[PDB]
Amino acid sequence: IPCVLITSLAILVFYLPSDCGEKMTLCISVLLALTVFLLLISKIVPPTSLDVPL
Amino acid sequence: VQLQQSGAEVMKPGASVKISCKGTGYTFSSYWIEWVKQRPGHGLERIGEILPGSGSTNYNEKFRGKATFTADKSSKTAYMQLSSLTSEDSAVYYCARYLPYYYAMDYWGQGTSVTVSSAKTTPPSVYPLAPGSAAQTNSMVTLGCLVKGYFPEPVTVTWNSGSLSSGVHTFPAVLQSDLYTLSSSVTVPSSTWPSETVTCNVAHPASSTKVDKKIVPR
Amino acid sequence: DVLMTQTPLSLPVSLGDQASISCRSSQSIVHSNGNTYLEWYLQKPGQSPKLLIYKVSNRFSGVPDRFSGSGSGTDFTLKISRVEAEDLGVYYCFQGSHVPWTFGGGTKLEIKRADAAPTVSIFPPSSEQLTSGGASVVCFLNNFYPKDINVKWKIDGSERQNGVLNSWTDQDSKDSTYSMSSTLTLTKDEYERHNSYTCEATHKTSTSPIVKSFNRNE
């Protein structure tokens, strides 16, 4: 559920006006959170050669 | 040490092949088995290798998906599986023993011949040859024979109990449309040829054929 | 995949002459341990390949001392000091450094000697061909050196190309010469309509193509 919540914010950057001056904050924060969740999941359930977790 | 391969095989296009290499006299599970393809034209191409001890396998770029290796630990043998077959796959396959970064490919299999075609095991159709009606008959003349519609290979072309061991020019077989054809030549004394009898014995062990058609001067 | 290139594709050299085979790689094939894994093989006709050299500075056991290798990260050369008839075959490169391991392109080796002119001959079809319902026009070209040989099938002044067979033999031993034979299959309705038949043979020894023709109408 947290992964889906973070993924759902990936699109909002394109509805955000360029005048507010916050596009970079949003997209970089989303990328950070995604990288962190990937690393945690890999610590828990390692992706080996034969199969990668979906 | 000995590496033993399966016998030759003949099958129609679109089928699948499973040839095997069996090794004895050494630790089978601890050596990479290298599969090498040699198209009759020319060139040695390496399909891949497998390590029987584990499941490790590597395939060359040109053969990914086309070939698949398997090995049995209990029985000292490894298998190569060929996917949907075509006329281009007609070649002789080798199995060799290899240990990377150390002594290499010091023992090979005998070789397995795989031929692909739609033809059936037709019997040989041997024909004789005679000098042209209007030709210059020199003191030395040649002699030859033709065989057509023979399948599969090989067909042994020999003279009367080795009558002419020297001077023979046997030529490799070729495909005309779908069947194989063969040709041969020999040199004999013009004076002696009428005196005695010489004939090209044609044998097709794959079809159990042994014929003999004498060639008489025109 | 690392690509290995061998030159020359052929190296005719008389007995007792030094023979050098060059080998080049797409990338450097030096390994981290300090060694470079390049192997040389020799495949005589009708036999499986035989190992000759590995880790070029080194040499396999049982081979004669006339062989030797050398080279740097990308350029390697094999050397044969004093050749014989037992050194005839195809020599291959093999790099064992980078996965996947690949073979060289091969390089046939021949022995050069006094070229000999061909002994041409044309054999018209036999009566058995007539009975069966075909016409096997057989043309022979034996004992010609070097490989520079060509045949033109001209009938009634018309150059016909389709349906022409070409088959030659490997270098002989006693005479060290090749042999070639181009047979021309013809059907009865097609065979008899012509009145003249010819099988031109062009060779370096005789620049003018040697002519062996006959007329069906007699």
Next chain:
Amino acid sequence: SEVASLDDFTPSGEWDIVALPGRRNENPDDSTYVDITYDFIIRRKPLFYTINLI
């Protein structure tokens, strides 16, 4: 044998066996020394670290 046996080996899944040669070594200057050394040449399967780091 010149190599170690793999007759009862279970594959690892994160390391790949390449070669397991063995060699008997003697010291020419000692004459009381002898040993047998096995080289384990192992190749990493890089999917996990590829995905997680590269």
